[PDB]
Design a binder for this molecule. Structure first.
Ligand SMILES: *c1ncc([N+](=O)[O-])s1
Ligand SMILES: *c1ncc([N+](=O)[O-])s1
Ligand SMILES: *c1ncc([N+](=O)[O-])s1
Ligand SMILES: *c1ncc([N+](=O)[O-])s1
Ligand SMILES: *c1ncc([N+](=O)[O-])s1
Ligand SMILES: *c1ncc([N+](=O)[O-])s1
Lengths: 306, 306
């Protein structure tokens, strides 16, 4: 009973966080095996970010310019190389706490856990989604650059996000762990901005199914809809189009509840056209879109990790 | 920038979770030093919960009746004793991962992180508040009995909650780590029920200050109020009374924003009397009450733990 925005347990990632300092810049890095990954912005100092040439900045740097601290232990840097927008700092010490891991890039609409960190020290953990416009609505202060996002499956940590910056609306932009930005953003200070977003339709439907599993039925109705007639109405309220593949992945939740996917779409259509009339769903007065179909199944089943 | 419901990093608690099995009952336990703490309900089996005498049930039990598993390692039980509604299982092995810890009981209105677990394996982490009626609005399935709630300060883990049961409205009841229930609940199957709740007024005000720190100002107004005139209006919408001590602890947030506490109360009064008129605050269409004044300061400052 109950349904909560739930993050993955963070212990496996906590044991990988370190502090990187170069010049007058300090940020967070990620220590796996004998490599420390961090944002390349660390080689910039208070004159080197309007239009930096990082290749030119990096070849001027000596290994000893890089202070890496793992707790109160100093790690010695023995090599460095730049891969897109991340640095790879080769250290003389392999992290004995390295979990099984993968570097994966996620799709907009997919969710993950963020471990927010300052000076290599973990501050909090929370769940995020990749918006359709490739930003994320996080919580990040000065110093949090280099904090990572991730998913866990059995014993494997799939790292998907490294934090780099704040956009002028208060949302956040970052890279995958190969250093490639999500969306049309750069690791400079330009006038770049988020650009328009949409609501993640398949996730809203997953959350409506969660509400039914949990005992809410008030929003159901007698009607059905075709997939075309739904998307027509859905485009009108700034919702992403729904595909047959989306219908297919909502199949398990449909079979568990006995509500055909297209009947749930009829519910959503009425909720979009009429509002909630002072009611709530799962403690929310807004249609929530940061739970995937898989999150709902995972939470409602009790799946664990080792 | 941004403001999120953030849980504490969970690694220190993950390394304390184990599985306890007795008869046909399996649940979660908490291994600190050479003691495993778990709900005493584990000595019940499918006939021993309508009106159990646990003292009488426990003296019939042999140490070898208790299977404790820490990962794929079996811990041998060498003693047992009952303390209120928890068991203390003395094992022959001290947990090398025992953090610095305290057992503390929290007040209604205070927040904490829950690490939901099944079979000794962590599933997810999320933030909760102790409601005024001593329940918590969690997310818990069959098998989650024995999961704990906690806070962290620097390097100290203050354990405050052990989960025991679900109430018929879908909310949850449990004990502190000395085995004393929060609120008027028992670890039997009776007809017990939650009883009426209220909204945590001081926390709503803290969250309004968070919104101002974050850039929302739309809900502010020109008016002020006395503390009496506010509580009059506040009682009317099922909100807890606000005290001078509450006013005092909101002082830091008032000084950071330049908005006197009683001017913020005037804002809340108007929001209670008029609604939001289709607007939102920090991505919510409801007045949120699960952030304490201290949570806001902690998040907006970047405080970390080691
Ligand atoms: C997923 N949401 C609610 C469940 N329940 O069984 O109470 S499972
Ligand atoms: C998760 N399982 C195995 C991995 N590997 O790199 O082998 S990651
Ligand atoms: C990490 N902190 C700041 C960055 N920037 O590109 O400005 S990256
Ligand atoms: C706490 N909430 C928002 C902050 N900010 O500085 O953007 S601090
Ligand atoms: C947090 N700091 C010290 C503790 N102790 O039991 O000594 S708990
Ligand atoms: C832990 N699981 C069930 C309990 N009960 O008192 O029924 S305690």
């Amino acid at each position: 009973s109950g349904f909560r925005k739930m993050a993955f347990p963070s212990g496996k990632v906590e044991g990988c966080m370190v502090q990187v300092t170069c010049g007058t810049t300090t940020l967070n890095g990620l220590w796996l095996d004998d490599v420390v990954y961090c944002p390349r912005h660390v080689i910039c100092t208070s004159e080197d970010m309007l239009n930096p040439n990082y290749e030119d900045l990096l070849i001027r740097k000596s290994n000893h310019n890089f202070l890496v601290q793992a707790g109160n232990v100093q790690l010695r840097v023995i090599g460095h190389s730049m891969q897109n927008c991340v640095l790879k700092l080769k250290v003389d010490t392999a992290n004995p706490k390295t979990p099984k891991y993968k570097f994966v890039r996620i799709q907009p609409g997919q969710t993950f856990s963020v471990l927010a960190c300052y000076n290599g020290s973990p501050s909090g953990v929370y769940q995020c989604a990749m918006r359709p416009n490739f930003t994320i609505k996080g919580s990040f202060l000065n110093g949090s650059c280099g904090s990572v996002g991730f998913n866990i499956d059995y014993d494997c940590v799939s790292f998907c996000y490294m934090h780099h910056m704040e956009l002028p609306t208060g949302v956040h932009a970052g890279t995958d762990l190969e250093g490639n930005f999500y969306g049309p953003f750069v690791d400079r200070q330009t006038a770049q901005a988020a650009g328009t977003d949409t609501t993640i339709t398949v996730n809203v439907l997953a959350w409506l199914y969660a509400a039914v599993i949990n005992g809410d039925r008030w929003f159901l109705n007698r009607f059905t809809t075709t997939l075309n007639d739904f998307n027509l109405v859905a485009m009108k309220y700034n919702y992403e189009p729904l595909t047959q593949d989306h219908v297919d992945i909502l199949g398990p939740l449909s079979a568990q509840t006995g509500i055909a996917v297209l009947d749930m779409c009829a519910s959503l259509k009425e909720l979009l056209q009429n509002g909630m009339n002072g009611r709530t769903i799962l403690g929310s007065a807004l249609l929530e879109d940061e739970f995937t179909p898989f999150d709902v199944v995972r939470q409602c089943s009790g799946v664990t990790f080792q």
